[PDB]
């Protein structure tokens, strides 16, 4: 049963690749390649919904 409807309230600046998320109504793929030295923390991939505060 994998429609859990989870929502992730993450800050807009805390997430990684802010330039990747630029674009209106555009399917922008994000890779789960985690950089160990970046302060921009990676996303959690299998969340269904996201809110960028």
């Amino acid at each position: 049963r994998g429609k859990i409807c989870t929502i992730g309230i993450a800050p807009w600046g805390i997430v990684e690749n802010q330039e990747d998320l630029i674009g209106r109504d555009v399917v922008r793929p994000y890779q789960t390649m985690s950089n160990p030295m970046s302060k921009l923390t990676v996303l959690n991939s299998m969340h269904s919904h996201f809110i960028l505060a």
Binding site: G23, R24, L52
Partner: protein, 48 residues
Amino acid sequence: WIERAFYKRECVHIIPSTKDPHRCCCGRLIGQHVWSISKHTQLSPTDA
């Protein structure tokens, strides 16, 4: 309708220094800069 109802913002004015000249209080770099408390953020429609 979602873009015309929900707005983003981006502090770009003032640009202070916090123990480093590139390190703004708004988090971005000094060259990267293009609440309003000591940030002077500007409201704009959301592009994300």
